[PDB]
Amino acid sequence: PVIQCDIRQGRTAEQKQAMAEAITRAVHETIGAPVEYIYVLIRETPGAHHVKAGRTLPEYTGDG
Amino acid sequence: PVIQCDIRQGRTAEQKQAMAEAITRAVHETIGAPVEYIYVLIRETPGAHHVKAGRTLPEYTGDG
Amino acid sequence: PVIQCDIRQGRTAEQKQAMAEAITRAVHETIGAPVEYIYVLIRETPGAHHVKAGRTLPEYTGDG
Amino acid sequence: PVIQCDIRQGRTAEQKQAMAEAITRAVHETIGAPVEYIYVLIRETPGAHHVKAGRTLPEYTGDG
Amino acid sequence: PVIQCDIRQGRTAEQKQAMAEAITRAVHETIGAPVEYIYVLIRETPGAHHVKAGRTLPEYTGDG
Amino acid sequence: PVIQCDIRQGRTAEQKQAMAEAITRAVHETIGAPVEYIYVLIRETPGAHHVKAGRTLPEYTGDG
């Protein structure tokens, strides 16, 4: 399967790889797709390019 | 974030919901996206519509 | 530009055409894309294939 | 619903937000999707990455 | 790479496989992507779901 | 039809245009879509954003 992830910019390389590995496991385990068939694609955009219910999303920083 | 999942047809409603929930948790935990921001979208296609490295994928049946 | 619209199944042909025309006008008027460059693509899915903030969306019926 | 907008780079932040708000209204009004379900995603690319009928599209500047 | 092909319904299984193979060869030969990395995904929609320059596309029948 | 090409960064403008023209011909010839209906969209990402079978893809350089 193809899993496309349009996420906000600002995560580390390690966070994005952790996401891709967790999604790969999740897909394999829940729908029985072989790992060899799984293709995860990550695309980053600014928060302003995510407009949900008419409102832009804030920039991600991980500050909390 | 938007997570699009192009998977082969033939899974049960329970399998697809399990996948969507597991992806939601995976994205939340690895990149810190609030659950409220996550949108998972599932599309089903025949196996013949997945052509990886020049080869058609088989149909998913749940059997093996 | 390409505008992909993943919507829930159940709308009439007239509703979907109205949406495509309104999006075409909206894109033309707000960002100055010539109408000739605009391509709107509509895909329908069951409500269960839309999982937002962990929750499945209901089926669209036209009633309420 | 998910509305993905692959547009050419070069618009202002205000033009892109106007587009996302107009698309949100257009979708809500034509197919009856609640605003809370609507997720607009904007991606920018160079004109050379839009190849329509075999021809690349020019860069957008808004000059006219 | 991922190559998504949103085409109008009505083609034979042989036509769609021919398209996927020809795209695989085209991508391999022009940008040097190894065949092993290429994933082609085909989705079919009614002609009415393709609205280009404000106009609906006709249904594909194989006749003319 | 819409053909979306998510490829790794690092190709020349000429390689990407050759790809788009070859895909346009391939689609026209195999499924009979008129060239005027064909819209190819190219998006570039780092190799680390392509995670296939759990493994990131290397950066493309064309060195061989």
A11 and chain B: CB distance < 8 Å anywhere? yes
Measure the CA–CA gap between C58 and C5, rounded to whole angstroms: 18
**SS3 for F2-60, per residue?**
EEEEEEECCCCHHHHHHHHHHHHHHHHHHHCCCHHHCEEEEEEECHHHEEECCEECCCC
Q: How was this structure obtained?
A: X-ray
D1 is catalytic: yes
Look up residue C48 and give its two tokens: 């269960």
E27 backbone dihedrals φ, ψ, rounded to 5°: -65, -45
- Identify the active-site residue in A1, A34, A46, A58: A1
**Per-domain boundaries in chain A:** 1-64
B53 and chain E: CB distance < 8 Å anywhere? yes
Measure the CA–CA gap between E32 and E25, rounded to whole angstroms: 10
Measure the CA–CA gap between C49 and D6, rounded to whole angstroms: 23
The residue of chain B nearest to residue A18, with distances taken between CA atoms, is B30
How many CA atoms within 13 Å lie on the side-chain side of D45? 24
Which of C38, C41, C44 has the CB atom closest to E53's CB atom? C38
Measure the CA–CA gap between B53 and E35, rounded to whole angstroms: 5
Interface test with F, best of E6, E29, E30 (most F CBs within 10 A): E30
The residue of chain D nearest to residue A8, with distances taken between CA atoms, is D41
Look up residue D40 and give its two tokens: 């607009």
Per the CB < 8 A criterion, the answer to whether E18 and E54 are in contact is no
Measure the CA–CA gap between E45 and B7, rounded to whole angstroms: 16
> Between the CA of residue D24 and those of B7, B33, C27, F38, what are the distances in Å?
28, 22, 11, 27
Measure the CA–CA gap between B63 and A46, rounded to whole angstroms: 43
Closest-CA residue to F19 (of F32, F33, F6, F36): F6
DSSP D53: T
Torsion of CA F13, E43, A7, F24, to 10 degrees: 10
Measure the CA–CA gap between B35 and B22, rounded to whole angstroms: 12
Look up residue E28 and give its two tokens: 């391999």
Single-letter amino acid, residue E14: E
> Between the CA of residue F52 and those of A34, A58, D3, F14, F61, what are the distances in Å?
11, 30, 26, 27, 19
Longest dimension (CA), chain B: 39
How many CA atoms within 13 Å lie on the side-chain side of A64? 5
Mode of pairing for the β-strands spanning F2-8 and F39-45: parallel
Instruction: Count CB neighbours of B11 within 10 A.
Output: 20
* Contact check, Cβ <8 Å, A29/B8: no
Per the CB < 8 A criterion, the answer to whether A52 and B63 are in contact is no
Per the CB < 8 A criterion, the answer to whether E43 and E6 are in contact is yes
Closest-CA residue to C28 (of F45, D26, F38): D26
How many CA atoms within 13 Å lie on the side-chain side of F13? 5
Mode of pairing for the β-strands spanning D39-45 and D2-8: parallel
Q: How far is C42 from chain E (nearest CA, A)?
A: 5
Closest-CA residue to D40 (of A48, E26, B22): A48
Chains touching chain E through at least 3 C-beta pairs below 8 angstroms are: A, B, C, F
| Chain A residues closer than 8 Å to F54 by CB | 20-21, 24, 35, 38
Q: Which segments of A1-64 does DSSP mark as H helices, in order?
A: 13-31
F42 backbone dihedrals φ, ψ, rounded to 5°: -110, 130
Single-letter amino acid, residue D42: I
> At what resolution in Å was this solved?
1.6
Per the CB < 8 A criterion, the answer to whether F1 and F39 are in contact is yes
**SS3 for B7-56, per residue?**
EECCCCHHHHHHHHHHHHHHHHHHHCCCHHHCEEEEEEECHHHEEECCEE
Instruction: Count CB neighbours of E19 within 10 A.
Output: 27
